[PDB]
Symmetry: D2
Subunit: 261 residues, 4 copies
């Protein structure tokens, strides 16, 4: 086996669906004990589905914006497992709003989940990784903010720029303690968030929006939750023991093309 | 004159001192009517010193984290000047804290000023730049977050990564309305913020810390408020009318050196 | 005056037309003594047109891929001027060819002009800049290679990646001697090269190709030779005395847009 | 098994030692049939060492700057194997020279191997990967040129900038034909090239130079040929089927540290 995560303990935020679910599945397939962290009531069934496929999956229903409850959850995971090796911060919200139409509710919702939620998760995990003398943190950014941007994404792009900068500073601070910190910057991925955005843009024909996005990618398809989980698994593994402080673009050359398609 | 800002109106946050003061001075020297926006009591003397050098300088003492008061201030500037051409977001705080020692007060202070303050400033200015059919926004990021990082800067680097991303999204959103938005990413610059950080590292001999920083820069000096103001003036000017959505590193090759 | 280049001496390669001509004009308007370097016999007329507008413009017809003729030309410029302050490497070729169809002649033509030409120009200039303890080098890269790429541009993108890397290493090497080195990475610019490419892609309606390119830029226009010259003038000036080792994208947010 | 390269054919340039040897070993451990391409007299023994560990390794002693001989070698590999899935371009030279001391021989040596050698390798492989309906190309760039640079590396950094740009253009051109192209940008790695540079800087005590470089890395060690091979294996595998056109920095945060 080139990848062996047996006896490693991972927490994945956003584990109930989308890329977090993909990351939890790949870590579990590699032999990790995985905890799905999600506010969604679907998270228990998500962990159940993985146990039925022979995987060591567990859940905690908790809101990552509640620092006290999240800290209590991670302390409990570390206590009952004896260690914490891997954190994937995949929980996020993708709300769009034109800059002049932004209200305090929208600003707060996107930044609390995307920024403070990743902050709270890292802050609860790092102490347990220091006890272990070993940790891997994989943050989810976006191409939106650090690389490219469209109109209508100022708060989301601000939130993912924050993750980009936070990732580099956390990597720098804990390199000497063998905690490696990296970000995945996904392009157009086939998730519930993307399907919802497609329905918002064209309620009559959401599939036609998905088809147009796929045609603008040089690889001619959206990324999958498996593609995202595969890169998170690589970064969590002994195959990536020298790779830290980097933001890796996973986009099928969507941001590479000089003219679109 | 290759640069002529005569008849243009500029708002500069952080205008009392440091790079904001440099930006306001260079815009004013190029002929702009400049307003220094700053919470510091030093802002009155800063505007007075520019008027004494023959420059068209004004101030509003206001906290950029107070969105209602900031909006009132910018609406008043636009009403009395008849236009708003240029916004420079230089106001910021440089507080360092080890990640595990961060408390809610530190997190909130740095993000409120560095992120929400730049947000509030852009949100109050953009309506006036749309009326003007023309606007230039220069945000101050840092090399810290987007390019490099040291231990003890998680909140600051998060705040400057936020500015990096926000800059690109605002540029994308308003390019069609001729509002150009760019960020300056300074390296080690000789400002009150840097002098305060030097005194924190070695209270007995702050100058020795400044000297060590200068020796680590390939150009062998810190940047100046003039260097920063010169780049802000370029970005605000007709010399930069096709340049938008970019984060320009102004660092004397500090981030370039390999070893 | 915020910019004063009065009696600084500048060499601009590719000075006969396109962005090189824009850079030479802006430096000369700021008061520089400018030499247009070009292989084209049109370079004499280009310098004449600037002198007729009251500018201090001169030409040398020389091939930048001939190291030994270019070195003789720059030595002559420095000897007759007493100094050399500014070098703009704007000469380039923009030939496209699908990777499997590349032949040695292609590969050589694009890399000799774009890479070895910039190499030869910097190598002949730097000693004269060191004599007066001051130099500014502005290299022309592209967004193509360092930032984005389309099919059919492997050799061009290779050449502009080379300029990107060379710019950073030359900046690092001479920072301590006050030679500042930066690159401009232009997007879609309105030059003779672009106009020729538009005519090639649609001889029936070249302007419609220019209009389609302009519509893909968030600012809704191509860049001009003036936009390019304006940034080179900034980088050559006392306004940019702390800025070195950087590659600046001048593209009206063409590479920023998530959807075109 | 998360990674299975069984029945895949890989060509690795620079396979005799250093990071090329690491890449060939990791691809072979994952089940690939690997051909070590190298001018070094060591290359036969390198392939023999892998066969002694039960791995499917072969060699061709050939100079990548000889386009006709390299093309003949790759044509022979594809004909005898029926396939070509993976190309790793690790062969390179690391010669340093101050800019004003560069001569035609130095310029030619570094650019012929680092640039034209990668070009010749890709040009010989791509036709076989199109027949295969599948290819993965991993080019070796450096942090030197695209990210950072020290004095004395103008030709090397030019060569690695060329690889950076060529990687992106080749990725763009072949994305639609399922050839994925990426670059690894290593930092300070423990290879014969690095050990040669260490011995050049201090012949009496090369290890002290290696120790100083390791101390400048936040992870406090040099990268290994295994670290490099592990990233090349990832990029060659089904785990990276949506990752193309990227230059990935593998450096233990060497380029990240501010001060
Ligand atoms: N989908 C894309 O194309 C795309 C592109 C760029 C980046 N991203 C980023 O990737 C990450 C994952 O996105 P996805 O598409 O899988 O999203 P998704 O909405 O499909 O899945 C998100 C998951 O996060 C959970 N979550 C949300 N808020 C939470 C909270 N407060 N507490 C706990 N769990 C919470 C949800 O319940 C859900 O299970 C996000 O950070 C997103 O911004 C998405
Ligand atoms: N000095 C450096 O080396 C350096 C390096 C990189 C980035 N930066 C950034 O550049 C910008 C300018 O920094 P500087 O060194 O000039 O800082 P400074 O502290 O010297 O000047 C900052 C100014 O902003 C004002 N300000 C702060 N909070 C404010 C608020 N809430 N409302 C109104 N005004 C407020 C201060 O009163 C002061 O006049 C900042 O965003 C900083 O984070 C500085
Ligand atoms: N036009 C664009 O959209 C665009 C965008 C990206 C980058 N660029 C780059 O910017 C630079 C300038 O481009 P331009 O559009 O002004 O080009 P152009 O072809 O319109 O003008 C180029 C000039 O270079 C000169 N030149 C060419 N080969 C020479 C040689 N061997 N010796 C001396 N002079 C020589 C020509 O004679 C001519 O005057 C080039 O490096 C180009 O590749 C162009
Ligand atoms: N070692 C570092 O720290 C470092 C850092 C960044 C980039 N790199 C790059 O990574 C790659 C691998 O470097 P390394 O340190 O493993 O090098 P090395 O010198 O240890 O190994 C290089 C191998 O390439 C072979 N090779 C060289 N020229 C050849 C030619 N003309 N034809 C065929 N084979 C040839 C050599 O014989 C040798 O086996 C190179 O492209 C190098 O420039 C190295
Ligand atoms: Na694009
Ligand atoms: Na550095």
């Amino acid at each position: 086996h080139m990848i062996n995560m047996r006896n490693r303990v991972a927490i994945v935020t956003g584990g109930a669906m989308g890329m977090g679910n993909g990351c939890a599945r790949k870590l579990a397939e590699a032999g990790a004990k995985v905890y799905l962290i999600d506010r969604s009531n679907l998270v228990a069934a998500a962990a159940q589905d993985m146990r039925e496929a022979g995987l060591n999956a567990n859940h905690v229903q908790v809101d990552i914006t509640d620092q006290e409850s999240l800290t209590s959850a991670y302390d409990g995971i570390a206590a009952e497992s004896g260690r914490l090796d891997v954190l994937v911060n995949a929980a996020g919200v993708g709300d769009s709003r034109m800059f002049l139409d932004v209200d305090d509710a929208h600003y707060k919702k996107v930044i609390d989940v995307n920024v403070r939620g990743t902050w709270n998760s890292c802050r609860a995990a790092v102490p347990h990784m220091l006890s272990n003398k070993h940790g891997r943190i994989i943050n989810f950014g976006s191409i939106s903010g650090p690389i490219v941007a469209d109109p209508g994404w100022t708060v989301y792009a601000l939130s993912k720029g924050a993750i980009f900068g936070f990732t580099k500073a956390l990597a720098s601070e804990f390199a000497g303690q063998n905690i490696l910190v990296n970000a995945i910057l996904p392009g157009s991925m086939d998730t519930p968030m993307m399907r919802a955005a497609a329905a918002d843009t064209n309620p009559a024909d959401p599939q036609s929006v998905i088809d147009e996005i796929a045609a603008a990618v040089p690889l001619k398809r959206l990324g999958t939750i498996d593609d995202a989980g595969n890169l998170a698994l690589f970064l969590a593994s002994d195959l990536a023991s020298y790779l830290t402080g980097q933001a890796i673009v996973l986009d099928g050359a969507f941001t590479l093309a000089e003219y679109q398609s």
